[PDB]
Design a protein around this ligand. Sequence first.
Ligand SMILES: CC(=O)N[C@@H]1[C@@H](O[C@@H]2O[C@H](CO)[C@H](O)[C@H](O[C@]3(C(=O)O)C[C@H](O)[C@@H](NC(C)=O)[C@H]([C@H](O)[C@H](O)CO)O3)[C@H]2O)[C@@H](O)[C@@H](CO)O[C@@H]1O
Ligand SMILES: CC(=O)N[C@@H]1[C@@H](O[C@@H]2O[C@H](CO)[C@H](O)[C@H](O[C@]3(C(=O)O)C[C@H](O)[C@@H](NC(C)=O)[C@H]([C@H](O)[C@H](O)CO)O3)[C@H]2O)[C@@H](O)[C@@H](CO)O[C@@H]1O
Ligand SMILES: [Ca+2]
Ligand SMILES: [Ca+2]
Ligand SMILES: [Ca+2]
Ligand SMILES: [Ca+2]
Length: 409
Amino acid sequence: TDTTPPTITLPQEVIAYRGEEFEFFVETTDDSGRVNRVIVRNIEGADNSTYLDPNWIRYSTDNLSVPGNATPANPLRTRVYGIVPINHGVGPGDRYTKYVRAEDAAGNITALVDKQSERFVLVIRPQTEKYTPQVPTLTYVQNANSLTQTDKDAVIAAVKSANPNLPATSTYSVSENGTVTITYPDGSTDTIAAAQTVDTDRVAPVFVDEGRDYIFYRGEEGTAELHFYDNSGKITNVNFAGDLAASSTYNTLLGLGFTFNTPNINNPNNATEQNPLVTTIRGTIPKSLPAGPGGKYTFKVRATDASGLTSEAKIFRIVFANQTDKYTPNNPGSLTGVLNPQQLSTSEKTAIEEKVRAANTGNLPNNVQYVVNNDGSVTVIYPDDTPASRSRDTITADRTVQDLRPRNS
Ligand SMILES: CC(=O)N[C@@H]1[C@@H](O[C@@H]2O[C@H](CO)[C@H](O)[C@H](O[C@]3(C(=O)O)C[C@H](O)[C@@H](NC(C)=O)[C@H]([C@H](O)[C@H](O)CO)O3)[C@H]2O)[C@@H](O)[C@@H](CO)O[C@@H]1O
Ligand SMILES: CC(=O)N[C@@H]1[C@@H](O[C@@H]2O[C@H](CO)[C@H](O)[C@H](O[C@]3(C(=O)O)C[C@H](O)[C@@H](NC(C)=O)[C@H]([C@H](O)[C@H](O)CO)O3)[C@H]2O)[C@@H](O)[C@@H](CO)O[C@@H]1O
Ligand SMILES: [Ca+2]
Ligand SMILES: [Ca+2]
Ligand SMILES: [Ca+2]
Ligand SMILES: [Ca+2]
């Protein structure tokens, strides 16, 4: 008959964190295939004892005392689980050696032998041994020895952002110099040193487009996109009117009807090199301003970061261009026969103008003017043309006129 007790397989050590749920499994088999009892108990007590302390160590075994419940293929599974109290000690003696016994249906029970038979040690550790926080992105501040509440909130946010797997019940404290204390729910802590959380902001924002000339064609609306970034990733102000000369130029452009829009100025993380802050300048230089050496506005812009560092005044320009600088007429698809190449008739001029018109729809402005000259060359006058800033193209008479005079006999 069966004289062999069941075989019990279980972890020798189970680390359980203070405050948290723990669970592990004990596996029991027997050659009979049936196990009738699995017991977790204190060493103390008579052979029949099932007294077990602490009260929060719990166990359960589904399928007890069922034929076929304890085979090698399908071992009997006993769950050992509980919640460690939040105020349990985590000292070296905060451990429990408890004994697991099993009995088959023939009554064979595993022997209970102090420090030798089947047992586990449940070891209670602080939550900080489970969690290792990651360093945040550096927060750049005006004074790393005296953080503002805004600085501290930013460090906490950057620590929480880099630590999505820490307990949600974890609290964060930032000291005057940026040292971060993370307090887990059991009162254990981690520290992130100030060197890994904050540094002094010593670099003013950068105007990426310093020195750039933005071309605006007279009489056509244009835009200029200006880009800024800071080492902190944040700009708080862009200032085109930092002194009298700058202000004058700025207000002159406003006077022409331009707009300046920097929509992300109040957003966080609005100004990195990869994703810079963008100021868009939109407007039209009217034709009443001529192009030429003086046909320009030289601006000065400054940008300030959240620590109060303001860049030097940095130059960019708007430079005016005539429309002829961006348009090139297409020649007519055929020449027009002329009886007298030195003096076209009205009908010949009309025919040329029509061919030049047809060749240029979709290319030149719809409000260009064509003047067919007496020799059949065509003056193209763009709508920004003025006496002070002529804006024109010429199509030569070899591209428009074909002499029809016969050849001698
Ligand atoms: C009460 C007594 O003297 N009993 C002895 C008995 O001693 C127990 O033997 C166990 C091993 O079989 C352990 O060595 C027990 O020590 C520990 C443990 O379980 O590891 C030490 C831990 O530090 C302690 N944990 C805490 C938080 O204090 C636990 C705990 O007090 C108990 O597990 C109760 O939950 O105990 C040791 O106490 C053994 O020596 C037998 C031999 O026959 O004689 C008496 O029964
Ligand atoms: C208008 C004025 O006299 N402002 C002076 C200021 O002198 C200005 O300083 C600017 C640099 O910050 C430019 O050098 C200004 O010159 C230009 C320019 O912007 O490039 C010359 C251009 O030809 C002119 N454009 C047109 C279409 O006439 C512009 C334009 O007049 C201005 O930008 C409008 O404000 O100006 C230069 O004039 C400087 O001298 C300060 C010192 O306190 O005093 C006034 O603000
Ligand atoms: Ca057996
Ligand atoms: Ca830790
Ligand atoms: Ca900065
Ligand atoms: Ca042209």
